[PDB]
Design a protein around this ligand. Structure first.
Ligand SMILES: *[C@@H]1O[C@H](CO)[C@@H](O[C@@H]2O[C@H](CO)[C@@H](O)[C@H](O)[C@H]2NC(C)=O)[C@H](O)[C@H]1NC(C)=O
Ligand SMILES: *[C@@H]1O[C@H](CO)[C@@H](O[C@@H]2O[C@H](CO)[C@@H](O)[C@H](O)[C@H]2NC(C)=O)[C@H](O)[C@H]1NC(C)=O
Lengths: 210, 208, 561, 561, 208, 210
């Protein structure tokens, strides 16, 4: 029995009602617990038996559904209820969980603050190439990065990194590290990082020299 | 019930690893069934297996021949050993406590990351980024993690620490500090690098 | 007129000639007499048959079975019919649609009156267990079924065996009377009497495939005293003849009149000779025959009917008023597991229906009374389709309300139809294994072994979910999983089994099994409404495949015979 | 010397006299020939037997069976033994302990050498399925078992039937050779040959209980031509004689030589005549015979052995590694319900063992080879006691560790012994119903019906607690309740079946069935340790009662015969 | 849950009696199983039978053919009718509420005495007892009960009220007051007799 | 399944440990509830599952035993815990209770205060005979009453009545009514009631005249 928790993301603002639908592969007959994993903790039990509720929770949580559709419904989605919610059948071993659903908090969208930089002199001594494009405080999730090497573009050798939902300011971060050898880097002077966001479809162009 | 597991933070590949979840509050042979649950890096979960109170065991059939769970009744301990590991099995591990008549994994251990890795312990390599926001790159350290804090947190505004990524089985990360243009190169900017395992700290300035 | 028959050196090294009249073949058992009669019958063409066959000059394989007459050692007539229903049957099945019923019955009156059986013509001639008619008259009716077409050549296999003194001789008097009617007849007589041996006009002999003397009886004595060892002294010289004629004895003693001018005389005679309805009327008519045969036999019918009635009553008494306590589940799932499995072994009797009439099947196919699909679909209409309906509807109607299963009418219909389908499918497997064999017992043990190995894979006795995957695939070969799964799909599905416990979203009882759903899913059965009926599609698919296997066995063994 | 035999008007109205020599009885079937031979055999005393019987002047009922010689129509020899083991058996069982083994074997050599069977004397004479020896030599051995005591009078029932031409005549040559040895022999011949008919010295006839002519063969022709209808013209005048001799024909045609001076001559001759080991050696010896017969037959033994081995493997595969989940109970209680019930129908083959040898049983009791308790306790040692041990110990040893039942050794022993006892008890019921019948099939269906009606009253399929009280009493007549109740008493009792639920003093799961105790009590089984073993006392009580019923059937049917 | 049953306080023999237990707090078809329990005069108890939430019924097999329990879902009522009664069935009756998954009869009605009797309503007959303690006897009243209180409780010291006993299917009782010797016959002693059903009160003095 | 709760009475003083042993007829496997009926109330649930305890009780109650023996054990038997305790299986319908055990409070024993009296004049007018013997404040339970009619004794036609455990003073009461016809009463003058108690084996003799 595989669960199928779709979709794996939502971005719903504070104090709202949100709905998560776990879909089993067979009948599991109200044997379906919801777990509520924080960032950096163990999955705490939220809903047992697909209707009930473990004591020690704000009782704003309501598990419904039967057959194969099950649904956690949150009325008045608070700050504490962002997290990752894993449905979990326990009808039969093995007790497959779900893929989890990472909730998000709604923000007004913004453009990424982008800043690409050359490496140090001692990395040029070691012969490594790693130019990093900074993508700060963008929202929402999806973003695209283009790399140009004096105009000549390359989409291979690319490394990326995202922080989580920065609940301090409801937005993201991303470092984009490009790493190649010495020859194809030090041949060139200017380097270009471009940002494709859903607000501004024109890619934001940044470049530097040496 | 109060659970706490503890063991190594690393194992070499194609070996065995052992963990121990010391249980305070019940007896292992008293009531519940006692359980091990891994969690892949990122999101996904996977129930591994329980030994119940009467010593019978049940294991997740993906993990056939590789897990074994044992019991030490006097100290209220129960152990996993995972044989023939793989760097896939780098995962957060958990001991968790299954009620039976409620059916749900009611209590959980606090958690310990287990990293199957072939590398040896390696000090970092600091490379700052000068051509407002400027960043430091840390390449090739081992093991996870290291912590960076810009001038030990002088200009804490707009500090973004990015998670580590593997590079040829050697960890790397970067960070960034978001400042104005007047503070550089006037104020001495230096990212604080702290490695607990190799006990190494490197401080390097940022200049044009 | 004159009906002659010719054989040039057929195979081994045997020559044949027949005048219009009466003739027998004779010899020790295993001497190839019945196999020579298989050659004369034209029943097996791919057998090694090397030589020339002429029937009044005409060749052998073209339409010989339609006008020839052939009767096996056994005289297999339907065990419950009378003479008149028999000859009306084979009369209206051999002869065309053009013959009216009055002319057909006129032929019937001339054949019965020709045999002198009008006193017995309304007596039930099938005498296996009821014993109404003497066996010699049953032999007369069996011959008369070949008298229907008014043949020219008649072949009779062992008419003397299985009778007493006088009746067999009287049968031979009626057959001599048929020789007076201008026909050629060939016997295969095991051990005769000297009186009818004196009544013979010609006789050949067989020694384990080797041709011995053909000729008259007095010339068997004459040409045999020419071969030495003269027969005298009242020693039954037909049987004493039989005692001297049985390897240099056979080859040499036959070879010394291979040289004789009688064998070269008939060899010079051999060199002198060198110079129905489509589909529907037949299955209605054969289905009428075996259907009346089932109505004619109250034993196998009414015995099974009283067994399923009193067994339905006992299951009604033991399980009476099924409670919805904790003890409900294993009691409701008990009786269902009985009934399905009951139907499965109640199909083992259906092994019998194609194996008993097997000699009548092959004899009736070599003569060509029917088409094979018309036979099979006809006989399936006769026995299987009504007799498998009765214990299903009797079981459902008398146990469904004693037990107190679901009061809905459609659920009663699904149980009704479900026991029907599992009865036809287990019976279909019984036919698929059974058809084409002569022994009931080995197929019976083999069916019992496959029904226990399907019994274990029902839901009750293993929990089909927790079989290991490398042999959990063979659940699907089990017929009572289909029956039992349907019967506990339509009957658990609304129920509830823990008093005082509603158990919808059940809490700190887990492990409780307090619905009918939890027993079904815990048993591993698709709770969706398609999961009920895919059992029936799997059923009907097994019916069609199993009957197709029996059908192909009949088309492939019909000429083996 | 001269052995004479006398009968004054015994019954009906039949007189008898026998010279020292050879004689047959002859007539149509159903003419009372074999019943007259029952009178001559002295097998049924309460039958109406009104007349005088003199054996050389001595009266009939005193010790006639010990020295007389009698052979039935069938020639039933053990199907796997040889000639020498047969005659060593019946030699060492008829003759006393005083005869040494060398003198016994000397008698064996004179009897085998007297019959001329030394070439075959080490060949396996039992030829049902292996077919090593011709049937006429098997008939010679069957007669030789009566030659062991060196009798004076020998009775043979139908030696001519069941043989071919020459071998039966050669047997009649050895029997004429025995008539040369100074003995009287009486046949009952169905339909003979004229050559040995010429070899007869005397012959009587029977017409449905009516005495016809006794006398020589040439004087059967002479005194029969005195009765008219003279036999001539090579018509086999023994068989033609047989065709004229068969109600004013019988009574008048016999009555016209009741008047004759030959019948008054022998009537004046009639008026002229008016003026072992205790217990142990025999059951060891017969148990040696049938025990070697079971070792001699690998078919019924090794077929059942490979069935219970591969069936034990399949039950080992399906149920492999029984988990203690929620699905444990109905899986553990599944396999137990299989095994017990398996043993029950694995006893249905034990219906066969007293019904096949029934003619050999009655023939060997009318001759008096043994005591009946020695026979029954001997044959029970031969087949039942080892062959019921094997699938019990094989089942327990190969399924007990695949399944993963209780690791204790004594629990393995209780399962071992339990399957033993339920096998012997179901087999004991199979003997109790089976013994004393001639047909296997009706007893087989009757045993199958009583085993299903005991199947329902096991614990699995009804919940025996909630039967209504007016027929819940008959639980106790069911053998698999005893077997299944023991096998799930020793195997559930320590267990536990809900993971994570200790369930001692179980709270808000009620209804849970989370021990083995709760399944036992909820099933209705005495959890006390006596409740395990009272199943075995009920078992052994059923063994003793059922075997006592079969024993009384043997003592009451032993003289019926 | 709050249960309250109410019906007649009497029935003639060989008839039927009906009671009704109005339930407030749940619905009859919602969760539990709903139950009737009698109690013989004195001590012994006897579970009679439950109708559960889905209308199926189970009855104590001693009471075969005689009890029937019905359901009125809209008012949350469930009824017993007991056919072919007997003065054995004079008993306190109770409706009680069975949980199922706890197994125990958790909640109970407050209770109503049901007396199968052939007699008609009969006023008392007061007979005082004079020759410290003196008593009044009350004979032949019907139905149960009557209450006596000495001078409506003037001398309440040592007042003992004894339970009623049948006499030819007519109830009787007595009482007693424990006083000194000076108060009689000085103070007017008169036992207070109160019959609710016949609405009769008889007052009689005690004199030598 | 019949329970068998033996014995049906105990008289144990305050603040003690007392033991009640319910004995089933089959195995009931910890399905055994104890109920605690007061005088004049409905049986309140005390012990569920034969070990546990419903909340709302002083936790001085302890249900032990398994197999067939079950046992309620009360440490420090208080005033409130006098009553009638009914064990009750619920393993299978019908749910037979026990016979109940009426606990009692220990008192120093006493002699019965006895006082027999003639009937009124109007009962003599109606012809009824009912002389009553008063048995006040005796302890313990069993007591015997003898009736003599001018010396001539009769043991037939006797009616009796007991109050319950008078917890005001830990003792009993009993009225003994003798009821006969007019002729055999009014023939006689003196009447005698005798009390047989376990303290004084001599029967206490009382008589009156008319
Ligand atoms: C189930 O739990 C019970 C306690 O509720 C255990 O039973 C007792 O356990 C203590 C110590 O654990 C022992 O001193 C007692 O002798 C036990 N009593 C009985 C009646 O067993 C029990 O051990 C637990 N079950 C299992 C299988 O361990
Ligand atoms: C079992 O209890 C459930 C409540 O937990 C009942 O289910 C609901 O009942 C209300 C009114 O009783 C209805 O309006 C809803 O439609 C019901 N929902 C479902 C999903 O059924 C239920 O009625 C109870 N069981 C029975 C058999 O009555």
């Amino acid at each position: 029995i595989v669960l199928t928790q779709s979709p794996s993301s939502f971005s719903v603002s504070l104090g709202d009602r949100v709905t998560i639908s776990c879909k089993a592969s067979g009948y599991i007959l109200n044997r379906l617990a919801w777990y509520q994993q924080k960032p950096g903790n163990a999955p705490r039990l939220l809903i047992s038996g697909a209707t009930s509720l473990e004591t020690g929770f704000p009782s704003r949580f309501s598990g419904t559904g039967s057959g194969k559709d099950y649904t956690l419904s949150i009325s008045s989605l608070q700050t504490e209820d962002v997290g990752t919610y894993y449905c979990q059948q326990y009808w039969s071993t093995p007790w497959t969980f779900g893929g989890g659903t990472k909730l998000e908090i709604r923000r007004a969208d913004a453009a990424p603050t982008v800043s690409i930089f050359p490496p140090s002199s001692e990395q040029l001594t070691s012969g490594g190439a790693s130019v990093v494009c900074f993508l700060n405080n963008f929202y929402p999730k999806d973003i695209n990065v283009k790399w140009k090497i004096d105009g000549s573009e390359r989409q291979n050798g690319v490394l990326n990194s995202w922080t989580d939902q920065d609940s301090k300011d409801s937005t993201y971060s991303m470092s984009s590290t490009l790493t190649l050898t010495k020859d194809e880097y030090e041949r060139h002077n200017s380097y270009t990082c471009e940002a494709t966001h859903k607000t501004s479809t024109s890619p934001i162009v940044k470049s530097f020299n040496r | 019930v109060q659970l706490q597991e503890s063991g190594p933070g690393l194992v070499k590949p194609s070996q065995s690893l052992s963990l121990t979840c010391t249980v305070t509050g019940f007896s292992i042979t008293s009531d519940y069934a006692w359980n091990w649950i891994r969690q892949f890096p990122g999101k996904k979960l996977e129930w591994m297996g329980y030994i119940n109170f009467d010593g019978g065991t049940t294991y997740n059939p993906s993990l056939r021949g590789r897990i074994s769970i044992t019991r030490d009744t006097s100290k209220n301990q129960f152990f996993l050993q995972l044989r023939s590991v793989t760097p896939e099995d780098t995962a957060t591990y958990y001991c968790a406590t299954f009620y039976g008549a409620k059916g749900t994994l009611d209590y959980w251990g606090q958690g310990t990351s287990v990293t199957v890795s072939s590398a040896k312990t390696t000090p970092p390599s600091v490379y700052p980024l000068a051509p407002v926001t400027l960043g430091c790159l840390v390449k090739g350290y081992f093991p996870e993690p290291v912590t960076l804090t810009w001038n030990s947190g002088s200009l804490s505004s707009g500090v973004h620490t990015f998670p580590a990524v593997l590079q040829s089985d050697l960890y790397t990360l970067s960070s960034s500090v978001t400042v104005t243009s007047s503070t550089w190169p006037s104020q001495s900017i230096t990212c604080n690098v702290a490695h607990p395992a190799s006990s190494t700290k490197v401080d390097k300035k940022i200049e044009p | 007129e004159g009906a002659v028959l010719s054989f040039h050196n057929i195979c081994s090294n045997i020559n044949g000639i027949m005048k219009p009249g009466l003739n027998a073949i004779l010899g020790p058992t295993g001497g190839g007499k019945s196999s020579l009669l298989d050659v004369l019958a034209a029943r097996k063409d791919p057998s090694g048959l090397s030589g020339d066959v002429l029937i009044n000059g005409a060749p052998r394989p073209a339409n010989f079975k339609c006008n020839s007459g052939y009767v096996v050692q056994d005289d297999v007539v339907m065990g419950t019919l009378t003479v008149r229903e028999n000859l009306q049957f084979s009369a209206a099945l051999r002869l065309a649609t053009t013959m009216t019923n009055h002319e057909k019955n006129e032929r019937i009156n001339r054949v019965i009156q020709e045999l002198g059986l009008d006193k017995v013509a309304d007596s039930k001639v099938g005498t296996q267990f009821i014993r109404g008619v003497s066996g010699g008259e049953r032999k007369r009716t069996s011959i008369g079924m070949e008298l229907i077409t008014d043949p020219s050549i008649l072949f009779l296999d062992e008419p003397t065996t299985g009778l007493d003194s006088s009746t067999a001789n009287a049968v031979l008097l009626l057959l001599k009377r048929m020789s007076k009617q201008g026909r050629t007849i060939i016997f295969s007589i095991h051990q005769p009497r000297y009186s009818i041996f004196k009544l013979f006009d010609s006789l050949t002999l067989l020694a384990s495939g080797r041709l011995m003397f053909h000729g008259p009886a007095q010339e068997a004595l004459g040409y045999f005293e020419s071969a030495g060892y003269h027969c005298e002294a009242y020693n039954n010289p037909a049987d004493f003849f039989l005692d001297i004629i049985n390897k240099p004895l056979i080859e040499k003693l036959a070879e010394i009149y291979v040289n004789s001018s009688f064998y070269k005389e008939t060899k010079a005679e051999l060199h002198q000779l060198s110079g129905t309805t489509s589909f529907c009327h037949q299955l209605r008519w054969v289905s009428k025959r075996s259907f009346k045969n089932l109505l004619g036999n109250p034993q196998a019918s009414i015995a099974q009917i009283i067994v399923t009635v009193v067994l339905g009553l006992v299951i009604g008494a033991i399980y009476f008023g099924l409670k919805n306590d904790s003890t409900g589940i294993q009691n409701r799932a008990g009786v269902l597991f009985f009934l399905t499995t009951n139907q499965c072994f109640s199909s083992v009797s259906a092994v019998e229906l194609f194996v008993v009439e097997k000699k009548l099947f092959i004899h009736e196919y070599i003569s060509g009374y029917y088409r094979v699909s018309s036979y099979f679909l006809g006989k399936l209409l006769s026995d299987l389709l009504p007799m498998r309906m009765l214990p299903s509807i009797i079981f459902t109607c008398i146990v469904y309300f004693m037990l107190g299963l679901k009061p809905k009418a459609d659920a009663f219909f699904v149980m009704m139809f479900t026991l029907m389908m599992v009865a036809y499918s287990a019976s279909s497997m019984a036919l698929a294994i059974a058809a084409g064999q002569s022994v009931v017992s080995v197929a019976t043990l083999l069916m019992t072994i496959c029904f226990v190995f399907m019994m274990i894979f029902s839901g009750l006795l293993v929990n089909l979910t927790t079989i290991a995957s490398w042999l959990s695939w063979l659940q699907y070969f089990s017929i009572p999983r289909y029956g039992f799964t349907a019967l506990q799909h339509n009957e658990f599905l609304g129920q509830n089994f823990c008093p005082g416990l509603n158990a919808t979203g059940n809490n700190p009882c887990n492990y409780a099994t307090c619905t009918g759903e939890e027993y079904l899913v815990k048993q591993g059965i698709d709770l969706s409404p398609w999961g009920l009926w895919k059992n029936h599609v799997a059923l009907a698919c097994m019916i069609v495949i199993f009957l197709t296997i029996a059908y192909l066995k009949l088309l492939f063994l019909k000429k083996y015979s």
